[PDB]
């Protein structure tokens, strides 16, 4: 549903954050949330679409697609 930009992504650790386009809270992104087995990494500043899941640890991205 939501669009955003990757704020940063640590490829060694396999996680980072996305800044949503609507200016809401940064959203955590884990490598297991990235759609497509060929990726499993994201790049700083990359445009993405994703669903937001609210978890115990905070808002997280799911089904992350590179646009």
């Amino acid at each position: 549903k939501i669009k955003g930009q990757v704020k940063w992504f640590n490829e060694s650790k396999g996680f980072g954050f996305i800044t949503p386009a609507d200016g809401s809270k940064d959203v955590f992104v884990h490598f297991s949330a990235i759609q497509g087995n060929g990726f499993k990494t994201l790049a700083e500043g990359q445009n993405v679409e994703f669903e937001i899941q609210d978890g115990q640890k905070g808002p997280a991205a799911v089904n992350v697609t590179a646009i």
Binding site: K13, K25, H30, S32, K57, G58
Partner: protein, 252 residues
């Protein structure tokens, strides 16, 4: 330290269940291994990082890391680690010989995040394991974790919102994964807050039980924040139980 018998009973009790005690994104492979190693070391070893990082954790003399060789014989309770991918894979060994081994594992198929893949027993014909972590099991069964100060209820107050709370002055350092701190109350329904980063730290003055989580309460920049630090089973009294921690606690 628990026994090898207790390791076997833990593995079979968790077959077909979803382990997500690290609290992040469903039933991931390292969640199972972290939970297993924490259980069998009676809470002494909380493994941090991705699956391939398991072999570089500090086992404090309670386990030995072995390399897989054509002659290596895995045993019940070993932790099999795959290190030749980006993030690795990890499994709890049930039995093995020189041709194959069987194990309990999560997220082999990639269904842990969406939740349909639970901890599953599978056979692997040495298709990637590079290391085996062998615990130094005790000879006799141990109940130390379940009776420890962490998993005993103690004394709590309750407020009008149903939150249990108590005073406790210590320091919390965030573990491998970030955690979102909430403004004003230990409630998942509070949208305001900030991301507490890995290895960030804060002194805290309060502990709370709320919304299936244990929380710490502290002040930052004049605002009251609550940070969840581990899961709580929602029960009180002799039924109270809390999960492995999401960081490291210290006193200064």
């Amino acid at each position: 330290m628990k026994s090898q018998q207790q390791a076997k009973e833990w593995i079979y009790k968790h077959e077909g269940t979803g382990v997500d005690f690290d609290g992040a994104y469903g039933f991931q492979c390292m969640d199972l291994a972290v939970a297993y190693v924490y259980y069998i070391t009676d809470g002494k070893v909380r493994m941090w990082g991705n699956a391939k990082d398991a072999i570089n954790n500090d086992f404090k003399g309670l386990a030995t890391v072995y390399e897989n060789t054509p002659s290596f014989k895995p045993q019940l309770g070993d932790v099999a680690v795959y290190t030749n991918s980006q993030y690795g894979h990890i499994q709890c060994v049930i039995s093995g010989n020189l041709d194959y081994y069987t194990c309990l594992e999560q997220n082999w198929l990639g269904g842990g995040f969406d939740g349909w893949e639970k901890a599953t027993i599978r056979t692997h014909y040495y298709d990637g394991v590079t290391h085996f972590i062998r615990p130094k099991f005790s000879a006799s069964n141990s109940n130390v974790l379940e009776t420890s100060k962490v998993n005993t209820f103690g004394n709590w107050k309750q407020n009008q919102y149903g939150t249990y709370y108590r005073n406790e002055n210590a320091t919390f350092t965030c573990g491998f994964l970030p955690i979102f701190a909430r403004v004003g109350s230990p409630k998942l329904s509070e949208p305001n807050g900030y991301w507490f980063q890995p290895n960030g730290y804060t002194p805290y003055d309060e502990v709370c039980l709320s919304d299936g989580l244990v929380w710490i309460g502290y002040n930052w920049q004049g605002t009251r924040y609550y940070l969840p630090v581990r899961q709580w089973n929602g029960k009180t009294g002799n039924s109270y139980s809390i999960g492995l921690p999401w960081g490291v606690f210290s006193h200064h």
